[PDB]
Enzyme design. Structure first.
Site, PDB file in Angstrom:
ATOM      1  N   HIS A  16       6.854  -7.246  -2.084  1.00  0.00           N
ATOM      2  CA  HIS A  16       6.708  -6.255  -0.590  1.00  0.00           C
ATOM      3  C   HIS A  16       7.900  -6.787   0.289  1.00  0.00           C
ATOM      4  O   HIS A  16       8.026  -6.391   1.187  1.00  0.00           O
ATOM      5  CB  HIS A  16       5.462  -6.682  -0.132  1.00  0.00           C
ATOM      6  N   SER A  48      -4.663   3.584   4.444  1.00  0.00           N
ATOM      7  CA  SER A  48      -4.813   2.763   3.045  1.00  0.00           C
ATOM      8  C   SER A  48      -4.715   1.282   3.510  1.00  0.00           C
ATOM      9  O   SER A  48      -5.685   0.748   3.337  1.00  0.00           O
ATOM     10  CB  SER A  48      -3.741   3.070   1.953  1.00  0.00           C
ATOM     11  N   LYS A  61       0.793  -1.105  -0.061  1.00  0.00           N
ATOM     12  CA  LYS A  61      -0.208  -0.005  -0.189  1.00  0.00           C
ATOM     13  C   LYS A  61       0.719   1.374  -0.001  1.00  0.00           C
ATOM     14  O   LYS A  61       0.624   2.068   0.870  1.00  0.00           O
ATOM     15  CB  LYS A  61      -0.974  -0.028   1.116  1.00  0.00           C
ATOM     16  N   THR A 112       2.457   0.758  -5.648  1.00  0.00           N
ATOM     17  CA  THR A 112       2.751  -0.292  -6.606  1.00  0.00           C
ATOM     18  C   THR A 112       1.930  -0.455  -7.901  1.00  0.00           C
ATOM     19  O   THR A 112       2.424  -0.268  -8.991  1.00  0.00           O
ATOM     20  CB  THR A 112       2.796  -1.665  -6.011  1.00  0.00           C
TER      21      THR A 112
HETATM   22  C1  LIG Z   1      -2.248  -8.338  -1.108  1.00  0.00           C
HETATM   23  C2  LIG Z   1      -1.451  -7.944  -2.655  1.00  0.00           C
HETATM   24  C3  LIG Z   1       0.061  -7.493  -2.306  1.00  0.00           C
HETATM   25  C4  LIG Z   1       0.155  -6.191  -1.354  1.00  0.00           C
HETATM   26  C5  LIG Z   1      -0.527  -5.237  -2.352  1.00  0.00           C
HETATM   27  O1  LIG Z   1      -0.300  -3.901  -2.417  1.00  0.00           O
HETATM   28  C6  LIG Z   1      -2.106  -5.192  -2.143  1.00  0.00           C
HETATM   29  C7  LIG Z   1      -2.157  -6.629  -3.225  1.00  0.00           C
HETATM   30  C8  LIG Z   1      -3.742  -7.232  -3.445  1.00  0.00           C
HETATM   31  C9  LIG Z   1      -3.874  -8.540  -4.771  1.00  0.00           C
HETATM   32  C10 LIG Z   1      -2.885  -9.667  -3.875  1.00  0.00           C
HETATM   33  C11 LIG Z   1      -1.610  -9.132  -3.639  1.00  0.00           C
HETATM   34  C12 LIG Z   1      -0.757 -10.501  -2.910  1.00  0.00           C
HETATM   35  C13 LIG Z   1      -0.696 -11.838  -3.981  1.00  0.00           C
HETATM   36  C14 LIG Z   1      -2.218 -12.037  -4.276  1.00  0.00           C
HETATM   37  C15 LIG Z   1      -2.804 -12.862  -3.148  1.00  0.00           C
HETATM   38  C16 LIG Z   1      -2.322 -13.216  -5.759  1.00  0.00           C
HETATM   39  O2  LIG Z   1      -1.722 -13.819  -6.262  1.00  0.00           O
HETATM   40  C17 LIG Z   1      -3.560 -12.421  -6.311  1.00  0.00           C
HETATM   41  C18 LIG Z   1      -4.204 -11.360  -5.455  1.00  0.00           C
HETATM   42  C19 LIG Z   1      -2.766 -10.941  -5.147  1.00  0.00           C
END
Ligand SMILES: C[C@]12CC[C@H](O)C[C@@H]1CC[C@@H]1[C@@H]2CC[C@]2(C)C(=O)CC[C@@H]12
Length: 279
Positions: A98, A128, A43, A46
């Site tokens: 991250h 956020s 957050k 990205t």
């Molecule tokens: C949480 C996040 C990584 C932290 C981001 O700024 C908010 C993103 C939302 C979508 C997530 C992603 C991690 C990997 C996930 C779980 C997938 O493979 C499909 C949905 C993806």
């Protein structure tokens, strides 16, 4: 059970992640010198940066960017699909991450690959983050925003301490393969930024292309993306379909913000003040 995927002293989402993999990533995964990764504490921006660059390769045409979820556009190595895909993928390659320094595949410190690390004002990241994560399925939840505030000022949250996460790569700011950006400058003037990017990344485009790009790459156009907003994300991932607002000043109570200032002070005090646009 725990409510969090704990790995190497760090909280991870349960769904879509895996320890074996978070390891298959550090002492196994192979980084090429012709790879691009957007380094970000969750957050922080990205999605935008992701779109921007994605626009580069497409040279303005937002057609692609529109019909493809960002996790596909720029996969998360750390994640299953991320890894699964990234590996069975051709080069060059681009992906998000991250991961704090110490968890990043060792194979990067050997290579010359280019990494962009977009840092954002933590207070806005706290907010956020809050709303977002509270609507994330299958993970501990704060009973109150006061509680999330507590969690964040201690690291006890997904991907660990934002402080930590920063302190981790800052010492690496000087390398010739590491470009450090910031939310502020990516918003308070999307122009420069895009320059440094294409520049650092070593690329140039027609004037009429840098045009088309700039268009589809300003806040609005961004905060209006049915892809850079996840949109069609498995309902299993989110607690509420609709949740899918405000500046940190609309959220921080006076005392909080106060406490949080003595915090940044002590914690970040061993770094260059100049390092943070935000007051
Ligand atoms: C949480 C996040 C990584 C932290 C981001 O700024 C908010 C993103 C939302 C979508 C997530 C992603 C991690 C990997 C996930 C779980 C997938 O493979 C499909 C949905 C993806």
């Amino acid at each position: 059970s725990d409510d969090f995927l704990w790995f190497e002293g760090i909280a991870f989402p349960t769904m879509g992640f895996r320890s074996e993999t978070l390891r298959k990533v550090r002492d196994e995964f192979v980084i090429r010198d012709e790879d691009v990764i957007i380094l970000t504490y969750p957050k922080s921006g990205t999605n935008w940066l992701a779109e921007i660059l994605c626009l580069m390769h497409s040279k303005g045409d937002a057609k692609w960017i529109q019909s493809v979820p960002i996790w596909e556009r720029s996969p998360w190595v750390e994640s299953e699909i991320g890894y699964t895909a990234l590996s069975e993928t051709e080069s060059p390659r681009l992906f998000s991450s991250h991961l704090p320094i110490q968890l990043f595949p060792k194979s990067f410190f050997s290579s010359k690959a280019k990494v962009i690390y977009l840092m954002r004002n933590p207070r806005d990241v706290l907010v956020s983050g809050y709303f977002f994560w509270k609507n994330w399925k299958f993970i501990k939840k704060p009973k109150s925003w006061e509680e999330y505030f507590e969690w964040f000022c201690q690291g006890t949250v997904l991907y660990g301490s934002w402080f930590d996460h920063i302190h981790g790569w800052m010492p690496m700011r000087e390398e010739k393969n590491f470009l450090l950006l910031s939310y502020e400058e990516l918003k308070q003037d999307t122009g420069r930024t895009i320059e440094k990017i294409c520049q650092f990344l070593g690329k140039t485009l027609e004037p009429e292309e840098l045009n088309l790009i700039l268009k589809n790459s300003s806040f609005q156009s961004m905060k209006e993306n049915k892809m850079s907003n996840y949109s069609l994300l498995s309902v299993d991932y989110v607690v509420d379909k609709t949740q899918l607002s405000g500046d940190w000043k609309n959220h921080f109570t006076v005392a909080q913000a106060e406490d949080f200032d003595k915090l940044f002070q002590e914690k970040m005090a061993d770094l260059p003040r100049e390092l943070f646009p935000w007051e």
